[PDB]
Every structure is written in structure tokens, then in C-alpha cells.
Design an enzyme around this catalytic site. Sequence first.
Site, PDB file in Angstrom:
ATOM      1  N   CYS C  87     -40.598  60.013 -50.424  1.00 41.82           N
ATOM      2  CA  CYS C  87     -40.043  61.143 -49.650  1.00 41.82           C
ATOM      3  C   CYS C  87     -38.711  60.775 -48.996  1.00 41.82           C
ATOM      4  O   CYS C  87     -37.975  61.688 -48.607  1.00 41.82           O
ATOM      5  CB  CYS C  87     -41.069  61.630 -48.623  1.00 41.82           C
ATOM      6  SG  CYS C  87     -42.800  61.442 -49.096  1.00 41.82           S
ATOM      7  N   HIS C 348     -40.542  71.101 -49.632  1.00 37.41           N
ATOM      8  CA  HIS C 348     -40.400  69.634 -49.602  1.00 37.41           C
ATOM      9  C   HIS C 348     -40.235  69.144 -51.046  1.00 37.41           C
ATOM     10  O   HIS C 348     -41.153  68.637 -51.685  1.00 37.41           O
ATOM     11  CB  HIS C 348     -41.631  69.046 -48.883  1.00 37.41           C
ATOM     12  CG  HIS C 348     -41.596  67.564 -48.716  1.00 37.41           C
ATOM     13  ND1 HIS C 348     -40.426  66.830 -48.800  1.00 37.41           N
ATOM     14  CD2 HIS C 348     -42.582  66.698 -48.442  1.00 37.41           C
ATOM     15  CE1 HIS C 348     -40.707  65.557 -48.564  1.00 37.41           C
ATOM     16  NE2 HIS C 348     -42.046  65.454 -48.389  1.00 37.41           N
ATOM     17  N   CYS C 378     -40.499  60.476 -42.784  1.00 35.13           N
ATOM     18  CA  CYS C 378     -41.621  59.598 -43.187  1.00 35.13           C
ATOM     19  C   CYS C 378     -41.742  59.654 -44.691  1.00 35.13           C
ATOM     20  O   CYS C 378     -41.248  60.642 -45.347  1.00 35.13           O
ATOM     21  CB  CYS C 378     -42.942  59.970 -42.535  1.00 35.13           C
ATOM     22  SG  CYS C 378     -43.564  61.639 -42.878  1.00 35.13           S
ATOM     23  N   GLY C 380     -44.299  58.472 -48.298  1.00 29.19           N
ATOM     24  CA  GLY C 380     -45.517  57.940 -48.937  1.00 29.19           C
ATOM     25  C   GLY C 380     -45.436  56.441 -49.105  1.00 29.19           C
ATOM     26  O   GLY C 380     -44.351  55.857 -49.410  1.00 29.19           O
TER      27      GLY C 380
END
Lengths: 392, 392, 392, 392
Positions: C87, C348, C378, C380
Amino acid sequence: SKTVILSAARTPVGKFGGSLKDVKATELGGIAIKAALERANVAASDVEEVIFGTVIQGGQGQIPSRQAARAAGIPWEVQTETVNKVCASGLRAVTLADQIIRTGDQSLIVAGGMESMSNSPYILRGARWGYRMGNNEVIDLNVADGLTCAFSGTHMGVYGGEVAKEDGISREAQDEWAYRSHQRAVSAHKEGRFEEEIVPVTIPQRKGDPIVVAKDEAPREDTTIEKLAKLKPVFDKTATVTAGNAPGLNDGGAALVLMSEDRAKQEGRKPLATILAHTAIAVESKDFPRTPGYAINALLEKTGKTIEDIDLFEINEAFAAVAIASTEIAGIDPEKLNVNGGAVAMGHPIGASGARIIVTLIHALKQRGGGIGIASICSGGGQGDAVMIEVH
Amino acid sequence: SKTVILSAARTPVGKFGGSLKDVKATELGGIAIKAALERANVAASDVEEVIFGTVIQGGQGQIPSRQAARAAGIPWEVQTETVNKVCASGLRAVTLADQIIRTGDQSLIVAGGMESMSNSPYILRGARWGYRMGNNEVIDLNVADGLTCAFSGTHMGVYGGEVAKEDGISREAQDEWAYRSHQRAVSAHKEGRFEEEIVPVTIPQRKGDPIVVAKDEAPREDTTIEKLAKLKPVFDKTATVTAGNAPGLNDGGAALVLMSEDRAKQEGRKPLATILAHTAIAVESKDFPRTPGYAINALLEKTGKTIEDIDLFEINEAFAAVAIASTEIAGIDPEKLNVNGGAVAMGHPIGASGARIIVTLIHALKQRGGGIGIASICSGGGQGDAVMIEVH
Amino acid sequence: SKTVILSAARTPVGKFGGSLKDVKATELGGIAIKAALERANVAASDVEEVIFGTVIQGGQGQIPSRQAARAAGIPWEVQTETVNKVCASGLRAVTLADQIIRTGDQSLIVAGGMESMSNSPYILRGARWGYRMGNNEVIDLNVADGLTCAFSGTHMGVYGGEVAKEDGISREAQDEWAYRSHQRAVSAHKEGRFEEEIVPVTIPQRKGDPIVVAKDEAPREDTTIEKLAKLKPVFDKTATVTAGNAPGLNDGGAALVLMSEDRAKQEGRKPLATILAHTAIAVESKDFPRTPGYAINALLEKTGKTIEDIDLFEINEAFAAVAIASTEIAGIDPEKLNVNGGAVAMGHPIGASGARIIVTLIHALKQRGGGIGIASICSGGGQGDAVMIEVH
Amino acid sequence: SKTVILSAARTPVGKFGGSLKDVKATELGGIAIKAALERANVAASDVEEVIFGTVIQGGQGQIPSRQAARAAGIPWEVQTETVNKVCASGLRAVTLADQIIRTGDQSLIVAGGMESMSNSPYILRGARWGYRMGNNEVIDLNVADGLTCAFSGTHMGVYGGEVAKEDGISREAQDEWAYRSHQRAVSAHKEGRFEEEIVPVTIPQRKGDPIVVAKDEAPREDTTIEKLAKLKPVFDKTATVTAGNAPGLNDGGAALVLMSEDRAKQEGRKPLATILAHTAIAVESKDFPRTPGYAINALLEKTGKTIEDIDLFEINEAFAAVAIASTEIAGIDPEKLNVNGGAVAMGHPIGASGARIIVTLIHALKQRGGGIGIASICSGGGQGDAVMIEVH
């Protein structure tokens, strides 16, 4: 008004991924049909109809029976259809040929069955219209179309183990039958009792001499009760059915040449056997392993015969427990059952087995000086078929 | 004892990915069988055998005929087999039922066919033992098992265009037949001539009330020669076959209830029709579109009838060119052919079509005050099958 | 010794299977890069390096960054690499460009990110060497490579819901944030606050006028608390995370033109913004949703600044609960957070989002008369990245 | 502050489907990283960043660099990203680590690359939204993402043979280089010249003791010109590139520990090597095999050195023809090139090779009493990267 069998041939049965892995099901059918025609001394061009069984048709191409017929050298002008009665396919091919001959519509039919479980594809059920999102399944077509119930999704081997448990057939009784099936198949090979029925498969070789497959791959002379007793249950942790006391997946082909009793007389032909009668019964899918004894009892009632009038039996060994329970249900002397071995040792190429057990029955009766035989087979979905023959 | 037909029912035919996309082949078979049993006033538990055709068996699960029988409410105790004669499957199911009834082995059989070309899977031939390296093919099973020759890989549509060209059948003649097939199917629907034979399909929804499909999806009231003449050849750039003058891919089911003539007389039944005779021929795979006229000529020779003795014909419209050429080969008056429309307009759900044309023939004869009809169908692999009926 | 941002552009964000479904990830990257170069008044041939993020690289072809560069008209002679920090990919592309510029090795870099979650393939893990027997999985690559933990197989949304539960963030608080994210994104569109940053995507059309996609597809003016409150938890029955209070799957591209502060002066360029500092932290995979507040606190410690020195924040809305908890962890006034809306409303597109939030932050600060901003994301696997910028 | 290399470790390179077939790419990365940390006497918890290359990311799961870091025992708190510069990935990981250390942002980084071409999946591009009808492709992800041009679809091997032909490099010259590459790799293995750099891979077995792989699998002591001259061109029938004079597909991992020169001096460490400089160039995709000589000439220009100042070269042998042509372009003495063998003999695990040649260069320089080396690699898409080191 009666049908005769002029000839009966089978390929060896190959193990899954084994000796016949590079041979298509239709090529195994072709080889068995060609041998049957040669042994009958019948011209490919005189065949009137080809009725052939195979269960995992997916990916075999249009009308697999026609591919087998052409691979045998039967001309384009001969009609054909492909039949599916799961494990009974190869036997129902023969009993349908009997019915058509009995109408007088045809007098010379090739019937049998084929299967290459080695070559069945995998399938994708959602790739056509799209999975959209999330993981899905890539499906073993032997599992989807052959080995699981269309209604419950339950493996045939789970039903085999549930029936063995309800019949009170012990693990040890199943292993003793598996041992005797191996030892009878090995002895039959070594003592020349499969040499007549088998047509070898020739597989061309780049490197030199072709591979000739002339022997059933799965029987093991080194089978022991002690070794079988160490195996773990394969379909269900609570069960008695193992990889050792039930057949696995296999490849093979088998074929019979059928003719009206009248035409055979007119042509001066000595039939190998006469089809006396057949019948079929059906039950719920989960009870399929119970059917062979029931089919035999129905065929004895239909013919006014009793179990003592029969010289030899072939009951396809879908599980050792099926051979054992069918014995008790029909009152069969086990010494007269599967005398050259059966599917626990030899394998279960599902679309072929129904034809394969008739080939085996005919030659076993001939070896014992002729008489009356019954071949009986249970099939996925809950059916049982039985045919009574006379070998002269 | 001849065989009689007590009832004949079909689902509407759906377009590929269309109205019946959410219904399994076996559910369309079940719906047709249940309607045929109700119309025959036959109890499902009195059926003795179910013979059902379907071509793309891959992924349908064990013995699809059994799935269709159970979906109709036929009990477990009724025997069944699934037959594959490609495009002729649903008709061969009927002619095999006739043969078995003529032996006396059974006196009450359900026969027919089904196909859900919308729901056929994709397959992977190398996924089992591995591709190892390099790109490979994910295979449409309608293409691999139904629509291409097992011997050459050539599409059935290439063979249809090759035969049209050799027969001298113009693009314009094919488009004219396509137009008349649509106009006849639309007129039959509007004037109530399919109300009797159709059983509507009810499809429960993930939302509100079920969708009821009661009409063939593919016929178009807006069909024009102008539109047909602008279409491009679909299978081969040099050819005359288009998406407009040949059927596409379709979904449907059809079923008939057959009984011995003697049992029907015993029960005081008025049969809908009598099966007089049937025959089949076979040629090289690439010649399959030529067979329906030859099957008709063989069936007339067999019955000692001439083309003038027949009131109506149903020749499955594999191509518009097959209807036209068959007319010339058999000497058929086109006013007696496919009079309520045919597959160019209605679709070609391959394993059902052979039963569907019999259902349509029966009703078309009943609508003209009865008489003698012939249904004839060509099939992939080079076969042709014809059946002669009498409607009282 | 410092890097300036000359320009910042983004495509609209498309819904899964939505407005941008027919546009490849590299084409979305290309469009955003080309717009960034035009707005910076920088020649494609003067770019020294292209650093581009994308997470689902499988099936995109060799070095996707190079495909995006060429689709923008950047010549072959310009070097490039593709980066994957799940991400955070699009943000780490920009912070790596900052580090390279700070060495003096390059002075003009294009950085950003792209993702087409609509176009990710499915995969087969056993097709190369063979499944041998039994059913297996066909795998959604968005799920395998983007949305599930490589260590546990657990969905990112399960971790989001576990963290919301441990932070004591109610269902109602999450739904109120989802409502405000939608209303701020809808207001930003309607009031012209996304017109500057967006570059429309033109999709050529057979039928006439092309499709111009100029608006974020996912924001909904008709979002209400009452509607959100009726949704069921989507990753876990016990949880508060729904389809309404977490983003789904999306498509988009975003790009920034970076230059050394020295070169920008020499060329008389007015930078849009200056990169002041960045930092990154890492935690166990399951704690990934906690990282944005921690990354902000680390960046404030590194720069000797406090939360009151910052004018605006962009914290990627991986879950509404992440925006809420990050607020409490960093002591942020929510009125200064995601002021034009965020991923719960906007989507996203995982490899783009890190670059997309920087584009959005720059324009929101510019709209509010300039100042200091932090973008934090943030990712993964358990990481958090934050960058501090000054808009003049 | 320059960057120093404290340690350099690689797995053996395995053949496609060979010795490392059962090991994931991330596990080969982990093994190399853990060995590099042990040899550097660096605690895993003191690492500040992991930069790792891998090309066929599809199906490896989220951020493969993080998987490799955790498999090495690096704690969750260490930041990471995965880089893709096709064949140059493992070298660009190292040069990016150098750039970040030169900023002062970090002082201790692990960099390297990994690839398991044996374990790359197959993909389905149309399974998500549906194929609808017709056969399609199941795609080898090594071919789609690693070995074919994203712009033309042309295999990298076609480009290698096109460049060999335009450079006038004979079939015989390529086979001679192939032979010398094998003889040098075999001699290095036998004479102990790979013992220091290799970390053996231990593979636990489903049976007895683990298998230890400690030797490169691909070099052959039995290599002859006679055999090489009989091979057929593998990528293009007109061409000179064969399976013998180009690497095939391979598995391996390689890793280096990098530290600031100042931190190394502070801790009293003796660096294994110093990174002096690096550069990269880019050309049209089809010209990728031409880049290593041009990257070397650019790096010499940048450092104000000439070819005579360099003690040893490692030019990745994408083709034997690349080694030969690069020699002519840079004016290299072949006795100073790939002196312990190269990819034609050793293999080309694409995402690892760029790190692997640095590991080999370092040890080859140490074996000759140190000096200045250049590692240069071409990559798919048209790039060339070169790094200059000094071994003390």
C-alpha cells in the site's frame, strides 16, 4: 432372438500415470476393438454399429465411440454412439447391443468400454462468465464426473466404507480378499490364463524398440496381509477402506464382437458364448456398493435359475467389501468368484471395467471347460447391472 | 408391438448466456421430463428406464440422465443411462427407447435430451502432469467436445460452408431460408402453435419473485434480408455461412414418454403418436451436413414409402444450407418442411435438438389434423438419423 | 540537499470493474506522468529517472514502470525501476526519488504509483509441475499478492477489524467517519477542489465521442449514517468493518515531478512544494493498521516539530478506524485530516494510493493558503511511511 | 561517506525444476541474507533496511523482500521494499542501498536479489471477467513478466540472436565462449574458488535426512565444442543462439551487507570491499544485449578511469554473444572477464543475477590479491547497470 459373442479382447490395465499414460482412451478402445475383430475373423467393413462406453468424456472430443471405431480401422460408414452408465458403461454397451440385435434391426455390433483416467483434464467452472473476485476451484474431472456423487459430492470410497461398516465386514476380511485378488491375478498372468484375452499395447519409441505393454501393471506378487494391515484408511479416518483393499485409478479398453445367433449359424461361426439374459436394478446413490448381489438375485428370478446353476461369477471389485458382501447376499461360493483376480489387484478403469469383467469371465469359463457365468457390476449413482452368458 | 409416444414436452430454447443461463442442463431435462409425465398422465414411479442425451458432459457430474430423472421426481429405483451421438443424442435416445420396448424388456421409457451450452466449462489438458514451460491453451469445452471435429480440429461451421459451396447453394438462398425460419417461428409463437409443446422454466431469483421463461428467446420479428446480406462469414472468410444463416449456441431440454402399443391399448390410452420406423447412416466427418436427405431416402426405402406419403418434415437446421440441400436430395416440398420454424431462428442446444425436433414435429402434425412425419438430423462426426411417426 | 515537487497529478479513482476497467495500470501511470510533466513544463526527454510503484505486478509484463514511462512519451534513454512496498508503493517511490536527488546522482525524477485491480489475473500454482490428482485452487492475484498476509493468509480487513476492536473504535464512530469522507469527497468535486489535481482519462469509442472519465467514481452524495448502519461486517462476523466503512478495490494512477532545489532555482522554477523530511517504521504484519500515527510521531521527533506545527494531514483511509485511531495516537484535530475526503469514499488503488494522498495533500494545502503537511500511509506486512512537505 | 560491503553470500544456482525446485524464492533470499549477516558479524536486529530484487513477483505474496528478511531472522521492526529492474534487480538493490547510505538516512542495509523460476505460476488473463467463448491462453509467468518484451511480445533470446548477428559474432565464437564459461565454473568449484561465497541450502525431506545443496547445478565438466556445434538455434531458426550458448532458467539468492564507510571505521570493521561508483544507461528494448559495454564506458568516463585501471570484470552472460561484444565495445582483455565462469555455465536466476555477479566479483578479486572490479548487467526493457568496487 438371441445374441452370441464371437470374440472378447482387452488391453492390459495400466496404473494411473503408468504404463498406458501416453495412450488416449479412444486408442485403447481402438486396440481392443481391432483385436476383437481379428479374433472373430470379422471384416471391419461388415460391422453395423459400435456401442462404446466411457465415463470421463470431457476433453475426449466429439463422440469418443467414433474415434475408437476409426482407430480400429472401422470405416466412416458404420454408425456409433457413446454410452455413459458410470462404472457400468462397458457392460451396458454390451447389453444394449444384445437388445438391438434381438429386435432384428442389426445383426453385427461391436460393444465395449474404454477409460484413460491418466489423461482426464482439469476444469474451470467460472472462467466462462468470470470469477469476478475471490479464490475458486480448479477441478479434477475424474473426481467431479467419475468418483463423487452428483447429489452429495461424497466420494464413492466413503459410500464403500459406510456399506462395509453396516454389513459388518472387518478390515481383516477386506485385506484377506485384497491378498487373494493379487495372488489370483499374479498366478493368472504367470500360468498363461490372461495370455488369450489380452491384446498388447504397442507405444512407438524414438530411441529404438517400441514399448509393448502386455501385462496388467497393478497386481503385486509381494502383496502380504501384514503389509495391507499397516495402511491407513484413505477416504475416511473412521473407515476400513484403504488404498490396498480398494482399486485406485486406471487406464484400459475392452471390446466384444456380438452377432445374432441366426447370422452366426448362416456364416458357420462357433460362438465363444451366448448371452442368455441380463437385468439392472437401481437404488439410492449411497447404496451403490450393495447392488451386485441384488442384480444377481433379480437375474436368477428372471431366468428361473438358482445360485447352484451358475459355474463362475465376476463381480467387479469396486471395494474388496463389495465382493465379500455380494457373496453373502447371493449365497456365492467365493471359490467361484473373480477366479483370475479382480479390480482390487487389477485396477478399475471405470468406463472399461464393465466390458473387462465380461472378457475375463468368458476366458475363465472357457479355461474351466465352459458353463454358465454371471458378470455383475455396481455403478456410481446407485445402479447394478448383471448379464448371464453360456460358454460352450 | 410397435412403440407409441404418449406425450412430448420441451423447454423454451434459450440464447447463449441468455434467459436460461442460470439453469443446469440436468434441471432443463428434469423440467421437460416432469411435464411429459404430467401430460401423459404417467406416475413417475411407473417409469422403467430413462434414456437421455447430452453432448458436453464434462463438468455435469456422474451420469447426467440420472440427475435429470431425479430433478423430474423419478424415484431412485428407475434405471438410466446417458447417450452421446453429438447433435443426434436426443433423437437416438428416442430410437434406442423404441428398440428396447420392441424387445419386450421394458414397456414404459422416458427419452430425450438436454444441453446448457451457457454452462459448459473451460478445461486444462496439461494441468494434471504439468505444462513445465511455455504458454498453452485454456479450452472451451463446447468448442473441443461439441463444435470441432475430433479428427481434424475443424469447426462444424467450416464443413457446413464447404458443403453449401459444393452444393451450389447461394448466400442469397441461405439468407432467404434464414428469414423464413424466423418468420415461421415468430408466427408459431404469436398464433399459439408452441403453447402446447412448451413447459415454461421458473427461475427463483436472489431478489423478488421467480422469472418465468415461456418463449423461445432466439427468433426475431425484426429479421430482414437487408441485415442478413450485410453479415460477414463467421467460420471462414471465403464462405457463405454467417451468424444469421446458421444457429449459434443454445440451452434447452426436451422429453417424450414412450410405451409399448400393447400396454397403451391395455390401459385404454389414446397415443399422441406411433413410431413407425427409424434408420441411421454414416459418412466421413466433413460430409456430416449432407446426411439428413440421405437418412430420409434410406428410411423411405426401408418402409417402402415415397416422399409423397409424408405430410410434414422436421430437418434440424444445422445450417440454412442443410435445409435447402436436403430438400433437393429428398425431393421435399419446402411448404412441408420446418413449418413452425427451425434451428436458424430457434437455436441448436446440441444434445436436446434431436428430441426438440420430434416434439415440434408431433405438434405441427397435430395442428394440421395429424398424418405421417419424418424428423431427420445430421450430427458431428458424420452421422444422419431419421425417424418416421404417425400422429392420430 | 533538498528536493522540490514541481507538479502533482492523479487520474480519477475508478471502482472495481468500473469506469477505468478497460485501462491498463501502466496506461493510468502514463496519463498521470504525462500530465505531471505538462504541468511542471518539463520536457519528457529531460527526465533522468522514473521510479514507479505497483503491487499486483503479476501479468503486467516486464518492468511496469518502463511501460508507464513510455506511455507518457518519456524516451527509451531514461532509466527506471518498479518498486513494491504494498500500500506504500506510490509514497516510497517519491521518498526514494528524494533520497537519490539528495545524493546529487540525479536532479530530475518522475515518481508515483499505479494499480488496475480490475485487471489483475487469476493464477494456478500447480499447473507447471502438475496437480496429479484432486481439486485445487484458482487464485485471485489481488487476494494472494495484495490483500492477504504472506505469513498467515489473513485478509488485511480482518486485521483492520481486530485493531478497531482493541482501540475501542465503535461501529457508529467508523460509520460517522465513512459519512464525512463521502460528503467531503462529493463537496470537493462539486466545489472544484479536485479539478486542478485530476487529469481526465480518455477511452477511445467505436460508436462516437470518447468516454472522458473526469470524476472519482466511488464517492456517493446519497451516503447516510442510517444506510451505513444496516450493512453487515464484510471480513469477519464478530467485527465492525463493513463494505461501507472501509475502501473496496480500485483503479488509478498518480505522479509527481521532483527536482533538486538547486536545479529548480537555476531554471527559474516556482516549486509547488518542498520535501522537508520522511521516515518509516515497521511492526508485526497484524499491527499494520496502527502504523500511521506512529510514523507521524517518529517524523515529528526527527524534525523537532510538534503536532501543532502541521497545517494539514493525509492519512490513507485503509479503514475508517485507521483515520480515527491515528487521530488519537498523534493528537490530530480531525478538521485538519483528509479534508477533501479519503479512501473510504474515494477508493484504495493500492500501488497508487501512496502517491495519490500526496497529490491530494499538496492541492488541499495550496487551497488553504499553503503551509506544512504530512502524508502517512500504513501498508500490508506491517509498515508505515510518512512524508512532511511545505507548500509555498 | 562512501558505502562499504561487509559481506557477500549466495546460494548455489539451481537448474529449472532441479536441485532447488522445492525452495521458495523468499527462502533462497532468507538463506543468503542470514549467511551475509553471520559473515559480516552483524546482528539481524541492527539492520536498518532490506532492499531486495525479484522479477516474477506474481504469486510470491505481499512484499517478497519482507518474506526474505523474516526468513533470515530479521525482526518485524526493520523496514523493507522490493525492487524490479528485470535482470538488473539484484544489482539495483545494491546501488539503491549505496545511494540511501550516502544520504546519511541509514548506515546499515541488506541488499540483494532472489528468483525461483521453477516456482513461478501460470496465469489466466480472462478468468476474472470471463472468456465468454472460444479457446484462450494459459500463460507461463516467467515468459510473460520476465522473458518477453512488454512492448513487442518478442523473447529476449530473439533480441540476443539479432544483436549477435548485427555484431558479426559467429556461432563458433559463441560456442567457444560457452565452453570456456563451463570450464572456468567447473575449475572454480573443483579448486575451492566458490567455497567462500556459497551458503549451502538445506532442504528437509518427506523421508529421511535433509538434502544439502552446496554446488552450482548447471556447469558441466563434460562440455565439448562438438556437442555445442550440433545444437539447434532455440529462439529463432535463422539465428546463432542455442540452449548451449545462452543460460536457461534458474533458481538462486544472493545478498550483501552494506554499511557507511564512517560507521565501519567507528566499529573497527575491515570492509570486504568499497563501492566506488555506479551508473546506468537505457536504450530501446530490442537493444538490451548491447548495454553492458556502454554502461562500463559511461562508468569509466564518470570516474575518470580507463579500462587499464580495472583488475577484473563480471559481465552477466545473458548470451555468450553479450560477453564477446561487450569485450570489443569496452576493450576488455577476456582473461580478466568472468574468470570463475558466468551465466552460460552457472545459470541466470533473473532477479538474483545482478547481486550474484557482485558476490562472484568480490571473491574473484579477493582470490587475486584484491583490486578494482566492475560488475555490469543488461536487463529486459533495454537497460544496463554497472558498479565499480575496490577489494582490499
